[PDB]
Design a protein around this nucleic acid. Sequence first.
RNA 1: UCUCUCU
RNA 2: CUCUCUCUCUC
RNA 3: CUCUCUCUCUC
RNA 4: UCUCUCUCUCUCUCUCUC
RNA 5: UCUCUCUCUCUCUCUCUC
RNA 6: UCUCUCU
Lengths: 462, 434, 454, 428
Amino acid sequence: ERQNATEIRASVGKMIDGIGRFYIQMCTELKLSDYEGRLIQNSLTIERMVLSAFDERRNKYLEEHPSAGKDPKKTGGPIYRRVDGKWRRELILYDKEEIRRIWRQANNGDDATAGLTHMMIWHSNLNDATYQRTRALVRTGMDPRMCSLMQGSTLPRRSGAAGAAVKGVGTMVMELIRMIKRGINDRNFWRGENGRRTRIAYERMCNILKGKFQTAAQRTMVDQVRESRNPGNAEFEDLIFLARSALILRGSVAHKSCLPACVYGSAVASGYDFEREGYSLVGIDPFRLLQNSQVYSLIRPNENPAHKSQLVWMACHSAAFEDLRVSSFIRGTKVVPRGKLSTRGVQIASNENMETMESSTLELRSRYWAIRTRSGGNTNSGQISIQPTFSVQRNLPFDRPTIMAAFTTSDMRTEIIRLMESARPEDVSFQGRGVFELSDEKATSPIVPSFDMSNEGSYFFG
Amino acid sequence: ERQNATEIRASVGKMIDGIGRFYIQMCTELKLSDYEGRLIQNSLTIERMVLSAFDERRNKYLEEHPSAGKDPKKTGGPIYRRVDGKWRRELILYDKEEIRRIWRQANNGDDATAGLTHMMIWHSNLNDATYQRTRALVRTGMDPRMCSLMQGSTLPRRSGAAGAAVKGVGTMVMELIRMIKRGINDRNFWRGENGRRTRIAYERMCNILKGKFQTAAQRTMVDQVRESRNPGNAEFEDLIFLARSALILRGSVAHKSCLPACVYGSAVASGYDFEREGYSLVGIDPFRLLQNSQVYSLIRPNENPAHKSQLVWMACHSAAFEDLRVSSFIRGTKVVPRGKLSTRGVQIASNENMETMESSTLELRSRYWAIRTRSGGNTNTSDMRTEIIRLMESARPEDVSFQGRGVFELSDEKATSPIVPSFDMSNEGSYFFG
Amino acid sequence: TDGERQNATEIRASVGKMIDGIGRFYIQMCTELKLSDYEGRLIQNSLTIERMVLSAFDERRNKYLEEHPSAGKDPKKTGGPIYRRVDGKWRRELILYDKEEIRRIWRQANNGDDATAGLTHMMIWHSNLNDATYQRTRALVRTGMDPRMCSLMQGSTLPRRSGAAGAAVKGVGTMVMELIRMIKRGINDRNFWRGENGRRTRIAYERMCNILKGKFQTAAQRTMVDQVRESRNPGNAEFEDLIFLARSALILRGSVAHKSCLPACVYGSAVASGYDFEREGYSLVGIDPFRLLQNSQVYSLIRPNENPAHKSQLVWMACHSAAFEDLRVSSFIRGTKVVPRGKLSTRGVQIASNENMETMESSTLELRSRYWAIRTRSGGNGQISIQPTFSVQRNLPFDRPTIMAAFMRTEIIRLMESARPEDVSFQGRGVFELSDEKATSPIVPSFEGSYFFG
Amino acid sequence: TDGERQNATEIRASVGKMIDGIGRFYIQMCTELKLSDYEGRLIQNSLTIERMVLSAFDERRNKYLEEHPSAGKDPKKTGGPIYRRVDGKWRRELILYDKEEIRRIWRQANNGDDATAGLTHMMIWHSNLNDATYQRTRALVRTGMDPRMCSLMQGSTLPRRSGAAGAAVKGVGTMVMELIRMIKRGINDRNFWRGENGRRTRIAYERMCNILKGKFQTAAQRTMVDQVRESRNPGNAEFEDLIFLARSALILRGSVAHKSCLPACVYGSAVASGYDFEREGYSLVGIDPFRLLQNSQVYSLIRPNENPAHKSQLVWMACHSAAFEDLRVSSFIRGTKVVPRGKLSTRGVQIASNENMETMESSTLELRSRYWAIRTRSGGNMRTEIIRLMESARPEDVSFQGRGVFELSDEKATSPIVPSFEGSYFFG
RNA sequence: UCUCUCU
RNA sequence: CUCUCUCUCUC
RNA sequence: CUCUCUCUCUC
RNA sequence: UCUCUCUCUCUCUCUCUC
RNA sequence: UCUCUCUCUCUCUCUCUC
RNA sequence: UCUCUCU
Ligand SMILES: *[C][C]([O])[C]O[C][C][C][N]C(=O)C1=[C]C(C2=C3[C]=[C]C(=O)[C]C3=OC3=C2[C]=[C]C(=O)[C]3)=C(C([O])=O)[C]=[C]1
Ligand SMILES: *[C][C]([O])[C]O[C][C][C][N]C(=O)C1=[C]C(C2=C3[C]=[C]C(=O)[C]C3=OC3=C2[C]=[C]C(=O)[C]3)=C(C([O])=O)[C]=[C]1
Ligand SMILES: *[C][C]([O])[C]O[C][C][C][N]C(=O)C1=[C]C(C2=C3[C]=[C]C(=O)[C]C3=OC3=C2[C]=[C]C(=O)[C]3)=C(C([O])=O)[C]=[C]1
Ligand SMILES: *[C][C]([O])[C]O[C][C][C][N]C(=O)C1=[C]C(C2=C3[C]=[C]C(=O)[C]C3=OC3=C2[C]=[C]C(=O)[C]3)=C(C([O])=O)[C]=[C]1
């Protein structure tokens, strides 16, 4: 049981080491200095170069249908250099085959797609913490208020099962609803070989959505949605109902700390063997890495570097939809809602005035650290029954409804509504779990927060 | 009929006396004082030394494949000494042959494996009362909520039939499911001489599981599981069904009070001849031994000694999965569920700060005493799943089992006048792990 | 139909997969025993290889051998006579193989599964060869049965390990002999039918009575078997009653399945030739065995002063399980006259240890038939109601006496007296040509002896 | 076949276990009677030991001896003449033994099992010896049968305790004589065939008639024996047809099983040599008895003026039950001419009390045969039809066509040696 | 000269 | 019937 | 309901 | 000669470049 | 992508009283 | 790891 855990840690560390040494090689090939190599924007550009080089289907499409005034075999992006204290942007072009060769040499001749998926999740978390997706929500017919379920909405299809665990209930519902809308518009959807392929995709997406849900009624309803040969308006409405139900009876969304490649590259250049030490995306390793890492960023004139650092921290730990109170408790500084952040996105546009732009250090440090969870809370585990030890008269208790429900009407909407009506926004989940100090590597002594003072806000996008 | 009972008591007392005099000899050889000899952690270390010395197969494997920076012929453990009121831990190493010689001399030149199995059951009960096994449950595909059937999950294979009676339905189902999973992955399982041996093991484990069950339908279903030449997914699912059915139509799991060796050693040094008086693991003897025994333990800073004492009491009487109401009635103090116990495990890790650690006396005393039972209560065509489901559907969590049986006062040695509890006041919790 | 095509296709693939395993296993064993093409195609060598497999998977006998080992023979090794041709002369050397080694080789050939269907297929092939070669009248008399009912002795040498598949191919006479031996042991041993074992024997007795009952066709015969089954302590009354049942089967023949189980050498040669039985499928009652034998060349050991054609006819008879079939029909299908057993100038196929393996020569077996027919699981030899479709005032007729009619020994005797040895059975069904793979145009024959064992 | 190989191997082990018990028990009794190697190999000693065991397990006679004790003999002790050679000369002393002690020794030698097969095997050996030595025309004349059918008296001395196995080896004449005694008892006693005991007698009469019917071969003989069985009150008429059936057996011979039951001394010697009959197996109709006798040395007590060769021939014939066989075939198998009974200069093997055990010397028995053959349970090939059948029968029809005699070195019986053939009647 | 409803 | 039966008796 | 039951593999 | 109350780590691979 | 009125002209079976 | 057409 311990051996499997140590191999898992070694494999994750291998992925991290590959990403870091690729970043070091890219910094060497780009002639970036230490400061320029630690800039988050340069790392964003380099990661996007990697992702676009290995986007096989898009590359093939670009070869078949060339873009306007662009070579389909070259990637690029903005690389920022400091000359005499002034920042300037450059568009430098790299062959896709060269990028692929460098990445494979970084991973010891292997095209490790796990690191690519890691960078993809990092970008998705950053986009989730920065930009809202209300327009896409409204277009598909879902309420703009279920933004908390839209984690991982920018993750592309090539992420696969690794990225599927990260995307929330809202994004899966949105994709299924898009499929149903396409089927409603054109009946030739779900017909032909493409029809068989899209039916398989629909079944697989419904199955992973079902795995996301926790209560039996939600699983039964998504099962009923999956069983329809030609899903129409009814299944789209049922999906919307399930998405709204996910606000109270939450789902199992996997949260991982995917740091920018600059941190990994600095760690690998420092001499940290992730293969020997081991890495975990849900434990203390990202926190320990972020505490002793220095990252720089570009601050547009009249912006608050503290707000940008908070945004990057939230993106790194995928805490965009987290309660502001617990996020502030872990960070030690107030996590300000999105409305009151005097900052724009991390990425710099091509039309910006690259003469008033400044540079600031990012405060990616937290007082406490906590375990990142897949669970969405308790829906209402333990000991169901008693095993008698003493020969005493006594009633022998057991949880009869829970035992029987595994051994047994067809309208589960009423049951779901009843379950959500029973719930109150005051129940305590994750009982007995707390936040650990940075020195508590083994997570032995937890600290439970007491939020029973004057009330701060709780929703980042509120 | 009485003569056989008195010989059984004499044999059990012989085992207890051997364990106690071994503990006395070990305390003499370790230069432990009385307080240090009564510490539960030192007794845990000594018992683990005994078990590792006599773990023949592991010792042979260690000789063939040496461990990293360890002598395969030496056992050890943390021994705690008090100097100027400050506790300090020491790692002292003892030859395995020396430990075996001392143990055999304790049992009069005999390698009494019964005492080793007794210590094994004590450790298993402590682990059951302290640590939950939900990860192993989920890995094997069983619900994490059938923890009440996982009694004796940490018992090693060398316990045999004595330890097999103690392990519950959940652990046996889990082991059978592991075997089925191994067979599913590799077809060379159940083939060859190893295949014949593992088929024999599977049949024996199925037979003792069948003996565990009470109703005829459960026995028929486990019989059908046993009869399959190549058990696959269907038998694993049927085993899961039987495990879930065991929550309502419970099984026959044997409960024994296996005390730490410190209590036995103190009793033997006091002058209690277990051979002449006789010992029973299901009667008043463990209660009477625990009432007049003093045990010390190490309390980490910011812990409740009452909660640790309750944990040790539950471990001693194997009441981990017991109803909290009856356990509190027998103890006289509220048995708090695991979630609200402000205490960690008994054992101290090697990385702990051995300068803020304190010592506390363990309150292993109960107001009443009760007989420990093997029974799981009263239970009242070729597809017996439907029949089992019907039987469980008939049952309600209000039926009274063990009718006419009560808890006896400590002075009632012969168990003559029972006391029946009336739990008909405001409801406390009932599940320890809830 | 139109739904049983799928089921027919499923069965063909499953049998083809079994045939593939036998061929794949034979090829592996041939390369491991170091046998050339000629020796690989020898029927005697294939017999030894097949018997080695059957003994390696005999769990019960192997256990008994371990507990009570024989003298000089360890119960973990099997083997048999392997015949090799060196310098033109033939020599026999006894090969010893570990049963675990043979079991692993067989399992590896069938993709790691036990595949007892392949073993039962080989056991049926041995039973067919035994039936066509040797006549067991001594067992018939020893059990008290009349030695004249040799036509019902189909599969009398099949071991009990062949259940279902073996039981379907075995005949009424063999089934009755099994019942009689159970009865005799009960009469001799009073403990029989009593105790824990008596319960096991009773269930075994019930099961084989039911399968025997399903073998019969007339209602009178089935009712007679049903009575015998009910007897809690069977004795002489059931002994005589079953004897009457066997005698009745000569006229009111039961349903005995007939399958063409070929030697493993034929399958091995076919599989080595790239032939894929699993893909195109197979059938033991269709044209597949006939087409395989046409293209297959098999050699055998011929003892001095033995007609090679007569041995080839014996192997041909065993291949198609036509030992008890009419000589005229067998002669028509083969194209060359089939001779009775008394006029066959040959001994058994299997060569004995005490035989001088120096005057022995090998010959090719002529296992080719001019025609091909479908093997039958049947023996020899209207509307009574109405279902209205229109709403009219008519009266719905039914044959009342016949419907209520279906709600011993004199009746059976009356049935056989009416029967005569001239009734035409299988009316309109004939024999096809090898080029006619779809059974489109039957060729009805027009027909001096007709008894092989006469 | 190919399925009866397992059955044959199973039967061989069961017979070998019986012989092992016989050999093991003899070894113990020799060690417990304190018999030397020479005395243990004496055929007279082996018979005495065998007779002690058979009487020790005779429940009915033992019960009658208890209820009605004999004069000077307690019914709980058995024994016989044991011949011991010390100082060159032979002497006989009666040994007395508890029947229960003998029973325990026999049972312990058979792993605690009764092993009634071994006792019957010894009983068949004694019958074979009696048949070759003594001719019982007195019983034939007393029962009303013509004394000329002495060829059908095979196993006439076998006790009724040997059921199944005993009945298989006994002949038509013995079966007829048993029935004739039943008829004579019924005719004399009117209460016979009536009452509770009459029912028991009727079932015995039916069962022994059934085995006689199975002993016959021609359909005519079976039907007539079927008629005799159906008689509820058999009398003189059933007397006659049984006599006629016996006379027909001289021409239309029945199927009588022939087994080679050797003396216990041979088995004891073989077991002491380490031979494991259970492992190697045994058979009473195959080569095993012949191969055992070739390597076995046994001695006998010779009365003065007696030819050792004739006594050895008598033992050889009794061993293989060739008392009523053709002398030419017996001579061909043995290799030395077999002499008829009238020309044998020897008396019975057993020595009587009234015989002076002082002029008696011992000789080695030549129980070795040049050839070996397989013992047969078969013969060769209303009432007017029966007489018609035996009229067509001639004493020249060849039987067992193509079946011959093999060599001791040919253990698989691969190459038969067909004989080509002046008397042929032992009792003639 | 003993004790017990209900593996 | 070239081997394929025998666990005993009107006990 | 106590007791001997002894362990497929170090796990 | 080890540690732990209370499944969340890991391979899952992509209907279409979107 | 077959054929047939009217008793099996094709529909196995995943081995044994282990 | 045996042998046999046909009491
Ligand atoms: C079990 C499972 O596998 C099941 O699944 C189901 C689903 C899938 N499918 C799909 O996708 C498809 C199909 C199809 C078809 C159809 C449809 C409908 C109806 O009704 C009919 C049909 O038919 C058919 C098909 C296919 C093929 C064939 O052959 C036939 C489609 C079309 O058609 O196009 C598509 C898709
Ligand atoms: C009564 C009782 O005893 C029964 O039991 C049963 C079970 C046991 N077994 C086991 O475990 C085993 C077996 C085996 C075998 C087999 C299998 C399967 C089949 O099919 C066949 C067979 O065969 C055999 C065997 C063994 C031995 C011999 O000889 C043969 C195994 C293997 O094989 O490996 C294992 C186990
Ligand atoms: C065998 C059967 O029957 C069962 O048994 C048991 C029960 C009944 N009982 C009897 O029988 C007996 C008993 C006894 C006893 C007694 C007697 C008398 C008196 O008084 C007392 C007593 O005690 C006792 C007993 C037993 C046991 C115990 O524990 C006690 C006897 C004697 O003793 O002897 C006999 C018989
Ligand atoms: C299989 C089942 O039973 C589970 O398993 C796990 C848990 C329990 N345990 C066991 O069994 C074992 C352990 C071990 C170990 C040890 C021992 C001793 C000492 O001292 C130390 C140690 O350490 C460790 C281990 C394991 C793992 C880790 O990680 C650490 C063993 C050895 O070592 O051999 C065996 C068994």
